[PDB]
C-alpha cells in the first residue's frame, strides 16, 4: 500500500 | 405518438464517446516524485472496462504537463456530435485541484474548462465525466451553465491523501471497474459509483510498518453537476 | 427468511432525525454583509418540506459564528440511536469552505467535523446531510471512514456566486423544494437532487440593469461521500 | 435578484  | 419522457441523457448517437487515459507511472527525477507501482494494472483494467462499454479508448503514458494541455486542447476541438458523452480518467500524484504531469503539475480547472457547454460545442448538454485518482493532500482517514454536465469521479474526500496497491492497482480504479463490470447494464451511473464509494469504504484498510501510514481508511466522492440520469445502456 | 439485500440506508428507525434550519438574514453592521432578502421565504419552505418527510425541524434565525459552532456541537453530543438521519441547512453568505456567522465566519468543515463517525456515535453508519445555499466565490456562469456517509447538497458550483431573489427565495432552495415534495415518496435522493440540478440550470436567469450580474445561470452541484442509496419513505 |  502507497499514497499517490 | 405516446407521452415522451426526458430525465435521463441521450445515449444512443452512433458512438459512446472517447475515453481518455492518461497513465502518469515515472516522473522526472527534478520533481522528487515516486514512481507510481500498480498503476498500469488500473490503467489496463479501465482500457478493458470502458472497452466493454463501447468507448473508444485511447491510452496515453507518462505525458508532461505541456503535453496533457495540448492532448485535452486537442480532443476538446475534436468534432465530438456523433458521440453520446465523453470520459477523461487521469491517474497521478496529485494535491487539491492538481493533477501532476511528469514534470510538474496541472489545475484540474485548466483541463476540464476545455470542456465547458460554451467552449465544447459538439458536447454541449451531454455528460462529461472526469474519473481521477490521485491525492488530495495529506490527511490520511446563455441557455445552459458553462459548468452543467460534468460529473467528478475523485478517488478520495477532498484534503486527503489517496491509497494505491503496488501489485493490485488503486483501491478507487480496482473497484470502479469492479462496479462497472457488474452493474452498467442495470444501475445509473450515480448508484455505481455509491457502490464503488461503500467498496472502497469497507473492503480496504492499508497496511504498513509506519505507524503514521497504518491501518488507515478511505472514502470517495462523487461532485455531480448533472442534469439527467446516465445510464451506459440504451433501448 | 428469504434473500435479503442491503444496498439502501435503514430509514424506518422511530424518528427520521432532526433537521436544522439555520437561517441568517441580518449580519452585525461592521461586517459589511447586506441583508439576505427572501431568505426568510426559504426558511418557511424548508420547515414545511422537511416537516411532511416527518424530520424533527428546529429553525435558527441570525445566529453568530459562536452561537452556529455552540448549535452543532450541542446537536451532535444528542442521543441520534432512535433517529434514521440528520439533516442540516445553511442559509447564509459565504465563500468556498465558508459559511457566515451574523459577526463573521465559520469553516463548514468545523460544522461538519462534529459529526464525523468517529465524533457521533449515534450517527455512525447513518446519512449526514449539508444542505448549503451560500457563495463559493465570485465567478459568474477503524472499521468505517470517518467521512463516510456526509452528503453536500451546495446550491452552485465551486467558486461561483449563488443566486436568490428577494421576492421568491434562493433558486437553489426554491428548486429543492418542489422536487422534494413532488419525488420524495418516488425517487432516491441522488436522482433528486439531478432533477434540481437542471430546474436550477433550465428555469432561472438572472435580471440585472448591471451588464455584469445580467444574463447569468447557475448550476448547484451535490458532493456524495453516501455509501448507499437514500429514499426517505420505507416499505 | 441578488447574490449570496
Ligand atoms: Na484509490
Ligand atoms: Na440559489
Same mark, same amino acid.
Given at each position: 500500500?502507497?499514497?499517490? | 405518438?405516446?407521452?415522451?419522457?426526458? +430525465?435521463?441523457?441521450?445515449?444512443?448517437?452512433?458512438?459512446?464517446?472517447?475515453?481518455?487515459?492518461? +497513465?502518469?507511472?515515472?516522473?522526472?527525477?527534478?520533481?522528487?516524485?515516486?514512481?507510481?507501482?500498480?498503476?498500469?494494472?488500473?490503467?489496463? +483494467?479501465?482500457?478493458?472496462?470502458?472497452?466493454?462499454?463501447?468507448?473508444?479508448?485511447?491510452?496515453?503514458?507518462?505525458?508532461?504537463?505541456?503535453?496533457?494541455?495540448?492532448?485535452?486542447?486537442?480532443?476538446?476541438?475534436?468534432?465530438?456530435?456523433?458521440?453520446?458523452?465523453?470520459?477523461?480518467?487521469?491517474?497521478?500524484?496529485?494535491?487539491?485541484?492538481?493533477?501532476?504531469?511528469?514534470?510538474?503539475?496541472?489545475?484540474?480547472?485548466?483541463?476540464?474548462? &476545455?470542456?465547458? !457547454?460554451?467552449?465544447?460545442?459538439?458536447?454541449? !448538454?451531454?455528460?462529461?465525466? &472526469?474519473?481521477?485518482?490521485?491525492?488530495? !493532500?495529506?490527511?490520511?482517514?446563455?441557455?445552459?451553465?458553462?459548468?452543467?454536465?460534468?460529473?467528478? @469521479?475523485?478517488? *478520495?474526500?477532498?484534503?486527503?491523501?489517496?491509497?494505491?496497491?503496488?501489485?493490485?492497482?488503486?483501491?478507487?480504479?480496482?473497484?470502479?471497474?469492479?462496479?462497472?463490470?457488474?452493474? @452498467?447494464?442495470?444501475?445509473?451511473?450515480?448508484?455505481?459509483? *455509491?457502490?464503488?464509494?461503500?467498496?472502497?469504504?469497507?473492503? &480496504?484498510?492499508?497496511?504498513? &510498518?509506519?505507524?503514521?501510514?497504518?491501518?488507515?481508511?478511505?472514502?470517495?466522492?462523487?461532485?455531480?453537476?448533472?442534469?439527467?440520469?446516465?445510464?451506459?445502456?440504451?433501448?
Amino acid at each position: 500500500d502507497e499514497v499517490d | 405518438s405516446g407521452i415522451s419522457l426526458d +430525465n435521463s441523457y441521450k445515449m444512443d448517437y452512433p458512438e459512446m464517446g472517447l475515453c481518455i487515459i492518461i +497513465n502518469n507511472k515515472n516522473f522526472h527525477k527534478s520533481t522528487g516524485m515516486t514512481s507510481r507501482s500498480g498503476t498500469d494494472v488500473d490503467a489496463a +483494467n479501465l482500457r478493458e472496462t470502458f472497452r466493454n462499454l463501447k468507448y473508444e479508448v485511447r491510452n496515453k503514458n507518462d505525458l508532461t504537463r505541456e503535453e496533457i494541455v495540448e492532448l485535452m486542447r486537442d480532443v476538446s476541438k475534436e468534432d465530438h456530435s456523433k458521440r453520446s458523452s465523453f470520459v477523461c480518467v487521469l491517474l497521478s500524484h496529485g494535491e487539491e485541484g492538481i493533477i501532476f504531469g511528469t514534470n510538474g503539475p496541472v489545475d484540474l480547472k485548466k483541463i476540464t474548462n &476545455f470542456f465547458r !457547454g460554451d467552449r465544447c460545442r459538439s458536447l454541449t !448538454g451531454k455528460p462529461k465525466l &472526469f474519473i481521477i485518482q490521485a491525492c488530495r !493532500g495529506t490527511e490520511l482517514d446563455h441557455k445552459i451553465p458553462v459548468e452543467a454536465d460534468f460529473l467528478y @469521479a475523485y478517488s *478520495t474526500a477532498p484534503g486527503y491523501y489517496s491509497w494505491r496497491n503496488s501489485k493490485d492497482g488503486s483501491w478507487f480504479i480496482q473497484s470502479l471497474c469492479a462496479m462497472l463490470k457488474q452493474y @452498467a447494464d442495470k444501475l445509473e451511473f450515480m448508484h455505481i459509483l *455509491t457502490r464503488v464509494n461503500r467498496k472502497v469504504a469497507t473492503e &480496504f484498510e492499508s497496511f504498513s &510498518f509506519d505507524a503514521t501510514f497504518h491501518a488507515k481508511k478511505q472514502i470517495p466522492c462523487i461532485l455531480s453537476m448533472l442534469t439527467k440520469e446516465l445510464y451506459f445502456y440504451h433501448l
